[PDB]
């Protein structure tokens, strides 16, 4: 509360560390469904169904331009990519499997770096 604070965590490396995680996600062989925004002119149903499209190139641009206020907002966009994937794609499909794989990959890096 006012004048009552937990000891100050060093957040000075967070930006660099999120960048590194994102590079690791970008270079994973199963990243291909997530690298660029879904083409809303060419994929029937996506625009109406997926209220908040997100992809790794969009996260990279937001990260590089100071649009994440803290590491929780960054994790929320990464998770949105996989939540969107699950919404639109059957589990038993190449893309559906890709999204589960990538979510697991991310969550381990996230825990290992920050927990």
From Swiss-Prot:
It is found in: Nucleus. Expressed at varying levels in several tissues, whereas a smaller transcript was expressed specifically in testis. It comes from the Eukaryota. Residues 9-113 form the Bromo domain. Regulatory subunit of the ATP-dependent BRF-1 and BRF-5 ISWI chromatin remodeling complexes, which form ordered nucleosome arrays on chromatin and facilitate access to DNA during DNA-templated processes such as DNA replication, transcription, and repair. Both complexes regulate the spacing of nucleosomes along the chromatin and have the ability to slide mononucleosomes to the center of a DNA template. The BRF-1 ISWI chromatin remodeling complex has a lower ATP hydrolysis rate than the BRF-5 ISWI chromatin remodeling complex. Belongs to the WAL family. Component of the BRF-1 ISWI chromatin remodeling complex, at least composed of SMARCA1 and BAZ2B, which regulates the spacing of histone octamers on the DNA template to facilitate access to DNA. Within the BRF-1 ISWI chromatin remodeling complex interacts with SMARCA1; the interaction is direct. Component of the BRF-5 ISWI chromatin remodeling complex, at least composed of SMARCA5/SNF2H and BAZ2B, which regulates the spacing of histone octamers on the DNA template to facilitate access to DNA. This is Bromodomain adjacent to zinc finger domain protein 2B. It comes from Homo sapiens. The gene is BAZ2B.
């Amino acid at each position: 509360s006012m004048s009552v604070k937990k000891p100050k965590r060093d957040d000075s490396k967070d930006l660099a560390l999120c960048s590194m995680i994102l590079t690791e996600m970008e270079t994973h062989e199963d990243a291909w469904p997530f690298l660029l925004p879904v083409n809303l002119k060419l994929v029937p149903g996506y625009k109406k169904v997926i209220k908040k499209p997100m992809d790794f190139s969009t996260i990279r641009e937001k990260l590089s331009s100071g649009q994440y206020p803290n590491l929780e907002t960054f994790a929320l966009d990464v998770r949105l990519v996989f939540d969107n994937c699950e919404t639109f794609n059957e589990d038993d499909s190449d893309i559906g499997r890709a999204g589960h794989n990538m979510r697991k990959y991310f969550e381990k890096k996230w825990t290992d770096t920050f927990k």
